[PDB]
Design a protein around this ligand. Structure first.
Ligand SMILES: O=C(O)[C@H]1O[C@@H](O[C@H]2[C@H](O)[C@H](O)[C@H](O[C@H]3[C@H](O)[C@H](O)[C@H](O)O[C@@H]3C(=O)O)O[C@@H]2C(=O)O)[C@@H](O)[C@@H](O)[C@@H]1O
Ligand SMILES: O=C(O)C1=C[C@H](O)[C@H](O)[C@H](O[C@H]2[C@H](O)[C@H](O)[C@H](O[C@H]3[C@H](O)[C@H](O)[C@H](O)O[C@@H]3C(=O)O)O[C@@H]2C(=O)O)O1
Length: 226
């Protein structure tokens, strides 16, 4: 008894350019499956027309992974001259007790390193400054450096919020409700890597492994420009 996101034409293009991974990195639904009305407790259309992702457990995910319409996985030059843009309108509900960080958008390399995660966090301390209940950008410093540069982007609201990620040349920018919150951060450490976007709910370090992380997207798209 779940309505499919494919019933809304605003999602046709991104679904055609995606596969759905749940609850780990295994694909549960390819583009053709998603367009044919795929729906489940972890991925469905709400009555007010949000695409909702929900998942429980440590490092579990309900997430779309960027694909080409050809069926090739997206694997664009992370630092190339072609711009790659992801845009989403996201409503982040108050998270259930025990949910401590939920990744909602990513730029990931074609191996094992996230270039960028945008996530909601219960708390973060950056250079001695603790912020609570915020949306955060985390950029890994390198493939062989587990550390990352972290930037608070927004105080958490439940209101629908526009996120834009713009990747071009060796630089990455993030706008939140039209305001630049990360301005051409350097990602040259991913020269020679290929990349793709992800969107959904990726549950990071929960304290209750049975609680559900839950993220709602009113719009979502990913595009190139040449
Ligand atoms: O408060 C800190 O900044 C803290 O960060 C620690 O390394 C983090 C790293 O910053 C990053 O957030 C990473 O994120 C993971 C993510 O949790 C998830 O597993 C994803 O799939 O992979 C990401 C990744 O590895 O890039 O998690 C690291 C972590 O150890 O939790 C340390 O640098 C720590 O000393 C520091 O205080
Ligand atoms: O999402 C992250 O931030 C992230 C960081 C962790 O350290 C892992 O690297 C984890 O990487 C995932 C990645 O997000 C993809 O889901 C990837 O999927 C590939 C796998 O080979 C799958 O088997 C799938 O069939 O093809 C996927 C693809 O490239 O699209 O898997 C890794 C991972 O779990 O190691 O995420």
């Amino acid at each position: 008894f779940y309505t499919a996101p494919s019933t809304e034409s605003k999602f046709t293009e991104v679904l055609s350019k995606a596969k759905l991974q749940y609850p780990t990195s295994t694909t549960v639904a390819f583009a053709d499956d998603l367009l044919d009305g795929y729906a489940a407790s972890y991925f469905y259309l709400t009555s007010d027309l949000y695409m909702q992702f929900q998942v429980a457990g440590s490092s579990q995910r309900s997430e779309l992974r960027e694909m080409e319409t050809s069926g090739d996985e997206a694997a664009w030059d992370c630092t190339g001259s072609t711009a790659h843009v992801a845009s989403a309108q996201i409503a982040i509900p108050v998270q259930e007790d025990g949910i401590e960080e939920v990744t909602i958008l990513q730029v990931h390399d074609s191996d094992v390193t996230p270039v960028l995660r945008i996530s909601w966090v219960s708390s973060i301390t950056i250079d001695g400054v603790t912020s609570e209940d915020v949306v955060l950008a985390t950029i890994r410093n390198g493939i062989d450096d587990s550390t990352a540069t972290k930037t608070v982007l927004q105080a958490h609201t439940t209101s629908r919020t526009e996120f834009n990620i713009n990747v071009q040349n060796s630089k990455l920018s993030i706008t939140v409700d039209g305001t630049t919150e990360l301005d051409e951060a350097d990602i040259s450490q991913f020269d020679g890597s290929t990349c793709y976007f992800k969107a959904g709910a990726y549950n990071n370090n929960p304290t209750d492994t049975s609680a559900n992380a839950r993220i709602k997207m009113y719009e979502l798209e990913w595009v190139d420009h040449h």
